[PDB]
Amino acid sequence: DKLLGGLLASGFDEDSCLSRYQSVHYRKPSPYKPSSYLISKLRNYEKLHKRCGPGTESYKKALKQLDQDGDGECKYVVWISFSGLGNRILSLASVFLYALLTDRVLLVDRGKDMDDLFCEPFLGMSWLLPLDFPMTDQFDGLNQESSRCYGYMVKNQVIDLSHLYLHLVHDYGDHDKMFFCEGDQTFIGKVPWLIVKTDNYFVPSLWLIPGFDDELNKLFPQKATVFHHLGRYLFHPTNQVWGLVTRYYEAYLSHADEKIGIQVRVFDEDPGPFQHVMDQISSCTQKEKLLPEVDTLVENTPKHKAVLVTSLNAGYAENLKSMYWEYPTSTGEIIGVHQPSQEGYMHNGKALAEMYLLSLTDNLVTSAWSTFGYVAQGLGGLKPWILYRPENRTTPDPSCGRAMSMEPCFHSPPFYDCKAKTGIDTGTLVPHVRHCEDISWGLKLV
Numbered sequence: 017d018k019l020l021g022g023l024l025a026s027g028f029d030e031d032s033c034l035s036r037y038q039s040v041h042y043r044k045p046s047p048y049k050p051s052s053y054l055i056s057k058l059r060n061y062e063k064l065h066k067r068c069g070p071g072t073e074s075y076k077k078a079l080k081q082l083d084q085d086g087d088g089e090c091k092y093v094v095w096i097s098f099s100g101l102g103n104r105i106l107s108l109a110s111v112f113l114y115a116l117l118t119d120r121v122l123l124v125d126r127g128k129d130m131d132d133l134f135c136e137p138f139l140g141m142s143w144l145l146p147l148d149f150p151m152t153d154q155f156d157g158l159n160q161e162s163s164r165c166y167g168y169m170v171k172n173q174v175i176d177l178s179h180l181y182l183h184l185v186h187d188y189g190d191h192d193k194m195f196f197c198e199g200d201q202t203f204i205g206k207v208p209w210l211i212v213k214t215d216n217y218f219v220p221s222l223w224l225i226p227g228f229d230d231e232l233n234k235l236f237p238q239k240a241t242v243f244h245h246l247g248r249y250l251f252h253p254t255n256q257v258w259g260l261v262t263r264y265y266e267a268y269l270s271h272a273d274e275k276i277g278i279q280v281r282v283f284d285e286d287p288g289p290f291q292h293v294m295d296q297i298s299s300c301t302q303k304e305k306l307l308p309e310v311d312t313l314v315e316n317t318p319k320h321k322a323v324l325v326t327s328l329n330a331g332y333a334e335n336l337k338s339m340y341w342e343y344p345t346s347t348g349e350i351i352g353v354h355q356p357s358q359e360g361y362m363h364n365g366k367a368l369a370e371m372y373l374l375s376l377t378d379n380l381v382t383s384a385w386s387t388f389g390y391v392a393q394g395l396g397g398l399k400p401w402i403l404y405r406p407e408n409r410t411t412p413d414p415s416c417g418r419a420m421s422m423e424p425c426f427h428s429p430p431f432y433d434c435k436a437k438t439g440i441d442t443g444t445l446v447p448h449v450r451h452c453e454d455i456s457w458g459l460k461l462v
């Protein structure tokens with residue numbers, strides 16, 4: 017089923033984006049079926065996008081509100097291309113959900129590479145913000161003190177509204193965080209143009225806004241499927257990225273009975289590679305029976321496992337590779353350890369290819385705090401084993417634990433009760449919104 021259970025629309029040109037419908041020759045079918053209401057919601061999104069999108073007569077009329085109000089036919093939310101690729105992917109998926117919940121059209125700031133990495137997701141009509149949008153060269157300078165920043169208008173009690181800037185970056189404050197309150201969403205609902213900048217996956221705090229909560233439950237009744245569905249919908253790699261994927265997979269990974277992904281990210285100043293991290297990896301994989309122990313004893317048909325290791329430093333894959341070369345397995349399993357080329361013969365090209373290759377594995381080990389890992393697990397429908405974040409170059413004990421769900425984590429959530437107007441722990445409100453495994457103050461859907 018190339019349409020992923022109805023998540024994807026038919027009718028796209030096959031050759032101009034091979035990944036779109038070929039992803040099925042490489043992936044097991046997801047066990048999570050998109051709800052019929054999410055399927056309607058996306059097919060209706062496409063209708064709206066086609067009516068209101070870039071370059072249409074409607075879009076051109078709405079652009080004049082920026083020089084005025086207005087009272088128009090089409091409203092928008094523009095995603096600003098900000099931060100690293102994994103932050104971008106998650107944040108964009110979040111802004112897309114927000115569009116869905118508010119009957120807005122999503123426009124994407126293409127930044128330096130978005131059109132080079134991704135195909136168009138909306139049948140008929142591009143998702144890219146036009147390059148001559150007049151506010152574009154203000155995007156980097158938009159901040160908490162910008163006149164039309166929502167938080168600035170809140171704290172100053174500004175009275176007038178064609179557009180608003182929503183500062184949702186990790187450094188945001190109390191006023192900016194009022195985005196996550198119902199009364200503020202009523203106000204913001206009236207503004208035809210929203211401009212968002214964020215480096216977080218802010219999905220889970222949408223679930224705690226009245227009104228959004230009812231709609232979200234209809235769309236995603238199993239709760240922890242938001243990124244799995246919206247990520248698969250939105251993001252299809254371009255043919256040159258997908259070539260990197262298919263060629264790697266077919267050469268190195270395709271013969272194995274089971275594929276293990278290991279996504280290594282080490283948040284440290286010094287270059288590496290670190291023994292305590294090597295030790296963490298071997299212990300994790302071996303205590304969870306993802307990879308077999310080796311032994312030095314002198315003294316029944318063999319599975320073949322392929323281990324895909326992604327990392328900035330090649331030492332982690334080398335260490336594992338060498339271990340399984342130099343010693344027999346205690347189980348008799350055949351282990352091959354593989355890592356993609358570090359040196360080129362599209363920096364982001366290879367990075368995206370690697371996230372996709374991880375998503376094609378059977379069991380995935382991720383690194384704590386890594387949005388790169390979140391993207392991979394989400395696209396693959398993998399509930400990972402998470403390598404906990406080390407402190408002071410000491411192997412954590414336990415080394416890893418299974419995640420609660422495949423969802424990504426919101427790293428910098430608000431902690432505010434909008435009704436009582438005071439701080440609250442927003443990870444103890446509803447059972448499906450919990451604190452993350454890897455980052456104790458973050459939130460995730462479970």
Ligand SMILES: OC[C@H]1O[C@@H](O[C@H]2[C@@H](OC[C@H]3O[C@@H](O[C@H]4[C@H](O)[C@@H](O)[C@H](O)O[C@@H]4CO)[C@H](O)[C@@H](O)[C@@H]3O[C@@H]3O[C@H](CO[C@H]4OC[C@@H](O)[C@H](O)[C@H]4O)[C@@H](O[C@@H]4O[C@H](CO[C@H]5OC[C@@H](O)[C@H](O)[C@H]5O)[C@@H](O)[C@H](O)[C@H]4O)[C@H](O)[C@H]3O)OC[C@@H](O)[C@@H]2O)[C@H](O)[C@@H](O)[C@H]1O
Pocket residue numbers: 099100103186188215216282283284285387427428429430431457
């Ligand atoms: O949403 C966060 C968002 O951040 C993006 O990255 C941006 C962010 O970087 C922060 C992290 O920097 C790392 O260092 C980088 C460095 O930026 C680069 O220059 C360098 O080349 O690479 C380095 C990595 O190799 C540090 O390793 C991190 O520590 C830092 O994360 C922040 O960590 C502190 C806590 O630090 C302690 O944790 C253990 C240990 O690792 C560290 O040394 C300790 O000191 C957090 O502060 C705590 O925050 C909590 C929660 O409060 C927040 O969230 C809830 C909201 O309501 C609050 O308003 C909000 O403040 C608070 O309760 C505690 O009191 C605080 O101590 C920070 O929250 C962590 O962010 O900023 C710089 C920018 O350059 C980066 O791009 C990242 O890419 C995104 O995925 C996402 O994580």
Ligand SMILES: [Cl-]
Pocket residue numbers: 063064067
């Ligand atoms: Cl419509």
Ligand SMILES: [Cl-]
Pocket residue numbers: 100101102103387388
């Ligand atoms: Cl990244």
Ligand SMILES: [Cl-]
Pocket residue numbers: 032033134135136
């Ligand atoms: Cl395309």
Ligand SMILES: [Cl-]
Pocket residue numbers: 159161
């Ligand atoms: Cl400023």
Ligand SMILES: [Cl-]
Pocket residue numbers: 197198199200434435
């Ligand atoms: Cl409110």
Ligand SMILES: [Cl-]
Pocket residue numbers: 049050051235236237238239241
């Ligand atoms: Cl669902």
Ligand SMILES: [Cl-]
Pocket residue numbers: 280281282283327328329
């Ligand atoms: Cl790293």
Ligand SMILES: [Cl-]
Pocket residue numbers: 378379380397398399400
């Ligand atoms: Cl899994």
Ligand SMILES: [K+]
Pocket residue numbers: 130131132133134135136254
């Ligand atoms: K493209």
Ligand SMILES: [K+]
Pocket residue numbers: 043044375376377378396397398
């Ligand atoms: K998979």
